[PDB]
C-alpha cells in the first residue's frame, strides 16, 4: 500500500507516534517519506546480507527475522513480512522499540539527513488529525 501524506499522518497519530519519546508526528511522516515514499511494500537489500523492510525501512540485521540475514537478531520479535502489511500497526510497534534505543530517530539515516532540525510540522499541514 502507498499511503498519502495525511492518511499516513492520521494512522501514525492513532498508533501513538505524536510526541512519542519527544518526536512530533511530523518527524515520523517525514521519515516515512524519505525512507519509503509512503510505501509499505518497499524493500532494499544492504551490502551485509540484511534487508530494510516497509514504510520505515526497518533493517533485518537487528530488528526482524527474514530467515536470510547472517549473524542477525530479531529484537522486535517478528517476521520481517509483518512490516510489509498495509496496516502499519506492527511497523509502528517495532519503530517504538527502535526509537527507545539511545539513538532515537538518529537510527533513520534519511530522517537525520532530510528531517532532523527542519520544520517538520509542514509534513502534517492541512491534515484531518
Amino acid at each position, epitope marked *: 500500500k502507498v499511503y498519502s501524506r495525511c492518511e499516513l499522518a492520521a494512522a501514525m497519530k492513532r498508533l501513538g507516534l505524536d510526541n512519542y*519519546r519527544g518526536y512530533s508526528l511530523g518527524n515520523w511522516v517525514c521519515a516515512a517519506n524519505y525512507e519509503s515514499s509512503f510505501n509499505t511494500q518497499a524493500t532494499n537489500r544492504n551490502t551485509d546480507g540484511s534487508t530494510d523492510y516497509g514504510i520505515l525501512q526497518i533493517n533485518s540485521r537487528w530488528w526482524c527475522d527474514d530467515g536470510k540475514t547472517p549473524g542477525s*537478531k530479531n529484537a522486535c520479535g517478528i517476521p520481517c513480512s509483518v512490516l510489509l502489511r498495509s496496516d502499519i500497526t506492527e511497523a509502528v510497534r517495532c519503530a517504538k522499540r527502535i526509537v527507545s534505543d539511545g539513538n532515537g530517530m538518529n537510527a533513520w539515516v534519511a530522517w537525520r539527513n532530510r528531517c532532523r532540525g527542519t520544520d517538520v510540522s509542514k509534513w502534517i499541514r492541512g491534515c484531518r488529525l
Partner: antibody
Amino acid sequence: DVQLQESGPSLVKPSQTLSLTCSVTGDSFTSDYWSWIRKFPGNRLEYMGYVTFSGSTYYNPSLKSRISITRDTSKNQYYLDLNSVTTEDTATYYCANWDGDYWGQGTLVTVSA
Amino acid sequence: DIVLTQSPATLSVTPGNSVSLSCRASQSIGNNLHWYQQKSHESPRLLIKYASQSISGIPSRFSGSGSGTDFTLSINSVETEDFGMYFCQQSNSWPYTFGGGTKLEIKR
C-alpha cells in the same frame, strides 16, 4: 522460555552501594532491553531504568546520578548498582524486560543501619 | 513527569459481574498505555499493551480501550482469581511512570 531471577543482599547499610543481579534463561538476552522497577510501601511503583543491547541506558531522574544498569552478554545476566543508598531506597526490586512480558520474582532490600 | 491517576482506588466485585477501571494521564500519551495485574506475593503481569492490544495467554475477558488522556481496563465475568492490584503504566515519555493502582476486592 524466558525466565528471570533476581539475586543480591536483603540488607544494605546507608551510604553503601546496592548491587543486584538478574539472571536470564534462553537465547533472547542480547536481543532485548532489560529493566529494573521497584515497589515502595503504599503500592508506589517506580520505573528505575533500562539498558539496551547497544549499551544505551535510560535512568529515572529521581535517582540522580546514583544508578547504573549494565549487562554481561557472555553470561545472560544484567546488573543494578545503586550508589549511596539511604533508608528511602528500601523497596522490593524487580527485573523485567522492556515490553513487560517477563518479570523476576522481586527481591526485598532493606536499607538500614 | 507524566502523572497517571487511577480511579476508583478500590473496587468491590461479586464474581460473575463485570467491572471497569480508569487511568487518566496528565498529558496526552496516544495509545502508549499498558495495564498490569499484581496479585499478592507475585510480580506484575502484563494484561494489555498499547491501550487495547491483547496479550497471548491472557483471558479474553480482559480488554482495554481509550486514547490520548483517558483509558479504561474492562474485566467481564470477574473471577475470584482476579483479586489484587491493577496498575497502568505509560511508555510515551521518559521516565516511564505508573498510576497509583486500583485494588480489586472480591465481594462475599
